[PDB]
Amino acid sequence: NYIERVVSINRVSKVVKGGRRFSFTALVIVGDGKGMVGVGYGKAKEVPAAIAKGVEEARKNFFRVPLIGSTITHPVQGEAAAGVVMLRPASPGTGVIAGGAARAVLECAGVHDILAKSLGSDNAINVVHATVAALKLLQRPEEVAARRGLPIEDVAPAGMLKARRESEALAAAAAREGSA
RNA sequence: UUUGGAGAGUUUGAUCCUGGCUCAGGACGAACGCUGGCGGCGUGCUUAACACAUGCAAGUCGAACGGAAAGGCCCUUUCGGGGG
Ligand SMILES: [Mg+2]
Ligand SMILES: [Mg+2]
Ligand SMILES: [Mg+2]
Ligand SMILES: [Mg+2]
Ligand SMILES: [Mg+2]
Ligand SMILES: [Mg+2]
Ligand SMILES: [Mg+2]
Ligand SMILES: [Mg+2]
Ligand SMILES: [Mg+2]
Ligand SMILES: [Mg+2]
Ligand SMILES: [Mg+2]
Ligand SMILES: [Mg+2]
């Protein structure tokens, strides 16, 4: 099961000797719900073809973002493209709060508690570029410890240690429920 | 070791940036238009620190003192009232 959300259908026109030629380009994000993000932006001659190309591009370009429980690990300064976006993991039930493209990508990724705030040049394409860059700029505590040659207890705080333990127990319970 | 960030529209043939304007919310000691049933609970001259008809919004102590205008009492009465 995958998710596709229409974010921005746009009209473009090109000029040659006879006059103006109109055109379409669209952007769409695809995700599985466990932390897999896929974006695709393409041009076409009409909405259905545009969406088809967008879905193809999204499938081709994927990414995996390790999540903790049901929220991001630490706050992310998403600097790229032309906009500036900042993110902050949240407590549960609060939800994932951001602007349009931010919410598109995040709900595609499957998160349910996060805070974001676009900080200039909100054009949807650049915003999504920045979100993807920030999301790939995340760090996994286990790999951080592995790189630093330091162990999990000493590297990671007890709070997120217990959070990860509870998430693991919940995942085991869900797997048992599914198998049974 | 715990609480908590929304953008959208508008330049161009078409984008991107910057930048300007406008809107989606809460709040009023608020006023006007329409509507209108009760009860509960607060609130109520922000401008003219403008002049202000009337009355209310500062009184208590004879066991501090002299006295008795009006009343209570008794001696009196011509019923004017006279003593304490
Ligand atoms: Mg910088
Ligand atoms: Mg560059
Ligand atoms: Mg900007
Ligand atoms: Mg903007
Ligand atoms: Mg709070
Ligand atoms: Mg315009
Ligand atoms: Mg312009
Ligand atoms: Mg134009
Ligand atoms: Mg009325
Ligand atoms: Mg009432
Ligand atoms: Mg009242
Ligand atoms: Mg006195």
UniProtKB/Swiss-Prot annotation:
Domain of life of the native organism: Bacteria
Entry domain remark: The N-terminal domain interacts with the head of the 30S subunit; the C-terminal domain interacts with the body and contacts protein S4. The interaction surface between S4 and S5 is involved in control of translational fidelity.
Name of the featured protein: Small ribosomal subunit protein uS5
Key words, A-Z: Ribonucleoprotein, Ribosomal protein, RNA-binding, rRNA-binding
Source organism of the structure: Mycolicibacterium smegmatis (strain ATCC 700084 / mc(2)155)
Stretches that traverse the bilayer: none
GO terms for biological process, alphabetical: translation
Residues of the full protein shown: 35 to 214 of 214
Entry keyword annotation includes tRNA processing: no
Coiled coil: none
UniProt record similarity statement: Belongs to the universal ribosomal protein uS5 family.
UniProt GO molecular function: rRNA binding; structural constituent of ribosome
Domain annotation S5 DRBM: ranges: 2-65
Function of the protein: With S4 and S12 plays an important role in translational accuracy. Located at the back of the 30S subunit body where it stabilizes the conformation of the head with respect to the body.
GO cellular component: small ribosomal subunit
Quaternary structure (record): Part of the 30S ribosomal subunit. Contacts proteins S4 and S8.
